[PDB]
Ligand binder design. Structure first.
Ligand SMILES: *[C@@H]1O[C@H](CO)[C@@H](O[C@@H]2O[C@H](CO)[C@@H](O)[C@H](O)[C@H]2NC(C)=O)[C@H](O)[C@H]1NC(C)=O
Ligand code: CU
Length: 223
């Protein structure tokens, strides 16, 4: 249980729920075929926001994960329970108007992921123990303009069967400045990119203890 509730750019937090479409309830999406897998949604309720956040292409945005909207600390319990081991992931989608695009459908491309490393540590654990900071590089080579950023943590502690994996995601609204447009990523859809049978979705992280993890979704776009 966690919420990507604010975004930091060039050292400046853009504000609670400002430019990030936040639910007030921190519960996960569990059906990967639901329209809610794109930018969260029913049976949660997601707020709108008229802020569109400017970011220079080639630089990083940092998603700031917190347990609830009311949370004002950054200790591990203020981010997400340590049982919630799994990957962190981020995607972009080029849109006409970042304040009105729903995010549902085709156009997403992956720009960051962090599953399990050589020492058996998970991406969510680096966020939980790293003050909730989830750093994400905006590619320099993409087209400028309006985008959605979908940042996600998947908790796998209850994922031995499907349904079981717990998908926590929120969409930020970006104005990307300075992109060269030299490369046009191949894209996937939400819902669509994930399936209940994926080896990183239906998985026991206990039996046997996991030594290598396949993050769901497409490969990471690189310039
Ligand atoms: C910008 O975000 C990228 C990820 O999109 C960060 O790169 C990862 O950084 C970690 C931590 O040092 C490494 O474990 C990874 O190998 C990096 N991944 C890749 C693909 O390069 C990067 O550190 C971030 N930069 C800043 C300044 O926050
Ligand atoms: Cu939870």
């Amino acid at each position: 249980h966690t919420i990507f509730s604010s975004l930091e750019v060039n050292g400046v937090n853009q504000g609670l729920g400002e430019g990030v479409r936040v639910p007030t309830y921190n519960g996960p999406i569990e059906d990967v075929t639901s329209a809610s897998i794109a930018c969260n949604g029913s049976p949660n309720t997601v707020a709108s926001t008229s802020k569109v956040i400017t970011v220079q292409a080639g630089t990083n945005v940092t998603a700031i994960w917190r347990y609830m909207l009311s949370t004002t600390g950054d200790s591990p319990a203020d981010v997400m329970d340590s049982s919630h081991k799994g990957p962190t992931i981020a995607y972009l989608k080029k849109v006409d108007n970042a304040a009105t695009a729903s995010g549902v459908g085709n156009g997403w491309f992956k720009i960051q992921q962090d599953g399990m490393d050589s020492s058996g540590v998970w991406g969510t654990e680096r966020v939980i123990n790293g003050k909730g900071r989830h750093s994400i590089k905006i590619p320099e080579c993409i087209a400028p303009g309006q985008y959605l950023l979908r940042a996600e943590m998947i908790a796998l502690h209850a994922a031995s069967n499907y349904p079981g994996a717990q998908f926590y995601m929120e969409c930020a609204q970006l104005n990307v400045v300075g992109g060269t447009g030299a490369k046009t990523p191949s894209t996937v859809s939400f819902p669509g990119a994930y399936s209940g049978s994926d080896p990183g979705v239906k998985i026991s992280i206990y039996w046997p203890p996991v030594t290598s993890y396949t993050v769901p979704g497409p490969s990471v776009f690189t310039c």
